[PDB]
Curated annotation (Swiss-Prot):
<dbReference type="InterPro" id="IPR036191">
    <property type="entry name" value="RRF_sf"/>
</dbReference>
<dbReference type="InterPro" id="IPR002661">
    <property type="entry name" value="Ribosome_recyc_fac"/>
</dbReference>
<dbReference type="InterPro" id="IPR023584">
    <property type="entry name" value="Ribosome_recyc_fac_dom"/>
</dbReference>
<dbReference type="Pfam" id="PF01765">
    <property type="entry name" value="RRF"/>
</dbReference>
<protein>
    <recommendedName>
        <fullName>Ribosome-recycling factor</fullName>
    </recommendedName>
</protein>
<comment type="function">
    <text>Responsible for the release of ribosomes from messenger RNA at the termination of protein biosynthesis. May increase the efficiency of translation by recycling ribosomes from one round of translation to another.</text>
</comment>
<keyword id="KW-0963">Cytoplasm</keyword>
<dbReference type="GO" id="GO:0006415">
    <property type="term" value="P:translational termination"/>
</dbReference>
<keyword id="KW-0648">Protein biosynthesis</keyword>
<dbReference type="GO" id="GO:0043023">
    <property type="term" value="F:ribosomal large subunit binding"/>
</dbReference>
<dbReference type="GO" id="GO:0005737">
    <property type="term" value="C:cytoplasm"/>
</dbReference>
<comment type="similarity">
    <text>Belongs to the RRF family.</text>
</comment>
<dbReference type="GO" id="GO:0006412">
    <property type="term" value="P:translation"/>
</dbReference>
Length: 184
């Protein structure tokens, strides 16, 4: 528990959680209310995520029903969705907004898998950045003489081990997502 190692675990864990989050909100073949968490609508002066203005549920195994209590929000949700890159078409019946998820095309799966991979690559990059920043902080301490050479090397090795275990975890969450997308 060098404050450095503790620090690396904290930041790397946070990075990994953000990635799992992004992968979780990603539009995929099956309906998931999670994809609307990033769709904001300007409601009474405030950019508002859709799920905060409506109950969201799954009816037809392939449908997302978005029911807003303020019926004037329907128009806004539709506008916002068409403007996003979800690749979904709102079905406004004046009461609720339906989002159907047709069987995905092999070109869509390939697109989504590519999108998951890039989300994860960015995470990896963040991981390696954390490693670099800490490593130099350790080097600094080693230069002032606070951390003798030997103690500095094992500290770096620990950081290197953490980096590898997190890069691995990233590769894993990517595989898990890739499977979810392909195993339809």
């Amino acid at each position: 528990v060098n404050p450095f190692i503790k620090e690396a675990k904290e930041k790397m864990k946070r990075t990994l959680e953000k990635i799992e989050d992004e992968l979780r909100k990603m539009r995929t073949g099956k309906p998931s209310p999670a994809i609307l968490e990033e769709i904001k609508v300007d409601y009474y002066g405030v950019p508002t995520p859709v799920n905060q203005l409506a109950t969201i549920s799954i009816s037809e195994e392939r449908t997302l029903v978005i029911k807003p209590w303020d019926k004037s929000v329907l128009s806004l949700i539709e506008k916002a969705i068409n403007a996003s890159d979800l690749g979904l078409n709102p079905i406004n019946d004046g009461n609720v907004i339906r989002l159907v998820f047709p069987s995905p095309t092999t070109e869509q799966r390939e697109k989504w898998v590519k999108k998951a991979k890039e989300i994860v690559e960015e995470g990896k990059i963040a991981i390696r950045n954390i490693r670099r920043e800490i490593l130099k902080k350790i080097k600094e301490d080693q230069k002032e003489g606070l951390i003798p050479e030997d103690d500095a090397k094992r500290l770096e090795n620990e950081i290197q081990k953490l980096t590898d275990e997190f890069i691995e975890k990233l590769d894993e969450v990517f595989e898990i997502k890739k499977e979810e997308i392909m195993e339809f």
